[PDB]
């Protein structure tokens, strides 16, 4: 399965970094610290090609992890899940790892294909974890930059 290596920055230009074994946080980084951005492997999965939506999976290129959405106490939750890197990416990716990549207002939105109207989100505040959210004050828009280095 062919995928693209990228970094993601929210609509407030906050970069995404690892803060734990299974956690990401969003914060503004100085230009010289741009290399700290977590590297995603975005793969295109077999699925629902509705007008303006494309099914994707988001792996961490440098870890045996994928973003997935599950329920915890009736609440849709984002998590980083350990996988065996040799079996991934899969064309038929498991439902929990599927995100609908939405292109709107020249930006990216990642909706859980498991939880409609739930998106990969960041808070306005500095250095808070990345989560599943979406009235409201959550940031759901991102820009994708390609990895060259």
């Amino acid at each position, epitope marked *: 399965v062919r995928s693209l290596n990228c970094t993601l920055r929210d609509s407030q230009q906050k970069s995404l970094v690892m*803060s734990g074994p299974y956690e990401l946080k969003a914060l503004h980084l*100085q230009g010289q610290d741009m290399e700290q951005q977590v590297v995603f492997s975005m793969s295109f999965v077999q699925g629902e090609e509705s007008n303006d939506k494309i099914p994707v999976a988001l792996g961490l290129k440098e870890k045996n992890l994928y973003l997935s959405c599950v329920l915890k106490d009736d609440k849709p939750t984002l998590q980083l899940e350990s996988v065996d890197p*040799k079996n991934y990416p899969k064309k038929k990716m498991e439902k929990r790892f599927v995100f609908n990549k939405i292109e709107i207002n020249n930006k990216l939105e990642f909706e859980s294909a498991q939880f409609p109207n739930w998106y990969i989100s960041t808070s306005q505040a500095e250095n808070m974890p990345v989560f599943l959210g979406g009235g409201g004050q959550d940031i759901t828009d991102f820009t994708m930059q390609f990895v060259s280095s």
Partner: antibody
Framework: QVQLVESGGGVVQPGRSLRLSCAASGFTFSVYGMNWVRQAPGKGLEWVAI????????YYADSVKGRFTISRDNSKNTLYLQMNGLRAEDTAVYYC???????????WGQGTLVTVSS | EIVLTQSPDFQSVTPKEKVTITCRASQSIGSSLHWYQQKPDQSPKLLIKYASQSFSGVPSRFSGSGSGTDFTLTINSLEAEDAAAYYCHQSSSLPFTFGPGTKVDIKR
């Protein structure tokens, strides 16, 4: 330029405790993960512990899990290692090392020798 | 925990020789495998990051390749100063681990 300077090594009795320090300069210390790696005389490198950039999380090797405590102070650009229940096996040169994206250890200190003996 | 093994334990190399040393992971680690150099009573230094990517200031003779479980470090024309211990380290998952190392010396 990136500089890492360890201090605090010395001779310690087994069962007692010792604090290691590692002062950083030449980079934004508050946004990089920091690690301790040790090497016993004539042996291979052994990863000891990691502390993520903000210090809200850490991780230890099984060999030191529970006996050792990794910490940092971002205002003083300093990395710490608190060693308890020190034993003869703990005799090693302790290096502090910065990691890039929780990946490679890109910059290393000069190391501090910890001697555990009666 | 992911275990790393290195082959050989010791390598004798004539200066100007192209030399290759290996590192094997007990589980698939993608490309999250790093190479370090360590001279005796000297601090280790990073050579190659993420299997095959260069690190600033490292001489061009050092080269890495591999993915999954099998990794190699190449010294394209060994120089006298290259006699040292060579370690691989994985960052795919916690706890982080180092391989046992390969000691490279000068053949005569």
């Amino acid at each position: 330029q990136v500089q890492l300077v360890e201090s605090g090594g010395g001779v310690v009795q087994p069962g007692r405790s010792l604090r290691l320090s590692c002062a950083a300069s030449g980079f934004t210390f508050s946004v990089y993960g920091m690690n301790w790696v040790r090497q016993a005389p004539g042996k291979g490198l052994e990863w000891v512990a990691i502390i993520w950039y903000d210090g809200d999380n850490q991780y230890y090797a099984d060999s030191v899990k529970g006996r050792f405590t990794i910490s940092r102070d971002n205002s003083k650009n300093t990395l710490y290692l608190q060693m308890n229940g020190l034993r003869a096996e703990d005799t090693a040169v302790y290096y502090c090392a910065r990691d890039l994206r929780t990946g490679p250890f890109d910059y290393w200190g000069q190391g501090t020798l910890v001697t555990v003996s009666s | 925990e992911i275990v790393l093994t290195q082959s050989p334990d010791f390598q004798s190399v004539t200066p100007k020789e192209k030399v290759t040393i290996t590192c094997r992971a007990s589980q698939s680690i993608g490309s999250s495998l790093h190479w370090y150099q360590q001279k005796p009573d000297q601090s280790p230094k990073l050579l190659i990051k993420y299997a095959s990517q260069s690190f600033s200031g490292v001489p061009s003779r050092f080269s890495g390749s591999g993915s999954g479980t099998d990794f190699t470090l190449t010294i394209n024309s060994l120089e006298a100063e290259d006699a040292a211990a060579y370690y691989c380290h994985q960052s795919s998952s916690l706890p982080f681990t180092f391989g046992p190392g390969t000691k490279v010396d000068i053949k005569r």
